[PDB]
Amino acid sequence: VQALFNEISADAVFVTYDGQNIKKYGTHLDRAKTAYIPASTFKIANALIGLENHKATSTEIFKWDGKPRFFKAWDKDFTLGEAMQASTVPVYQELARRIGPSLMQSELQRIGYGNMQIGTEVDQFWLKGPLTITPIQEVKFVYDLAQGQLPFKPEVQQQVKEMLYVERRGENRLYAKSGWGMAVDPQVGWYVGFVEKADGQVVAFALNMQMKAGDDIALRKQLSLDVLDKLGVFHYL
């Protein structure tokens, strides 16, 4: 496995969690216990909090306001599920404003997410701070989501799980979310999720890497799939 980390001069770590054991792979293992903004990985929590507190539904359509967004791809209507996969920040900023600065702070504290700090602006905190979370915190969190063990209603955790559904290989399923924290120095890269393996075993993962400005968008996922293949968690079909 070991070549395919530095072959690109990457400052990165890959974490796996099986519900008893934490495993660390990569060029820089100490990133695993290091705190970073969640960026768009926070969308997982955001949806959970919104659904649980009746501020949104899995079926509701978030319509485009007509004004151009960061990507032309985002210039359309989205469900929270669609917006999750496209990582459509404007939709989730809206969800967060429905939630509110007091409720969002209370809920994050309630579920112990990262350092539990959001500050004054409810639609910015995951994008620039002060909310921070380690990769180990991220894997445990999604693993808990996978098992329906988070402090949310079971139906809520299920609905979000479905939002995360990325690919099926045979009897195995991949659930994942991406993050790119551009508004921070240095930039940070996330690929987070779990695989529901055929044998019924769940393995949760997190990739956390330094982002050297504008490198390729697909890199985070490609590495994680490669590592997942190398680990025998999610073999290439």
Residue numbers in the entry: 44 to 280
From the manuscript:
Structurally, β-lactamase has a loop-rich region that includes the highly conserved Ω-loop. The Ω-loop of the class D β-lactamases contains a pivotal Trp residue that contributes to ζ-carbamic acid formation on the Lys base catalyst residue.
The substrate-binding cleft between the two domains was a cavity in the loop-rich region that contained four loops: α3–α4 (97–122), Ω-loop (155–177), β6–β7 (225–230), and β8–α10 (254–260). The cleft had an arch-like architecture formed by Phe113 and Phe114 of α3–α4, Met225 of β6–β7, and Ile260 of β8–α10, with the side chains of Phe113 and Met255 forming a roof over the cleft at a 4.2 Å distance. The Ω-loop was attached to a side end of the cleft through a short α-helix motif (Phe168–Trp169–Leu170–Lys171), and the indole ring of Trp169 in the Ω-loop was inserted into the active site. The averaged RMSD was 0.25 Å in the Ω-loop, which was significantly lower than the overall RMSD by 0.49 Å, thus indicating that the Ω-loop structure is static.
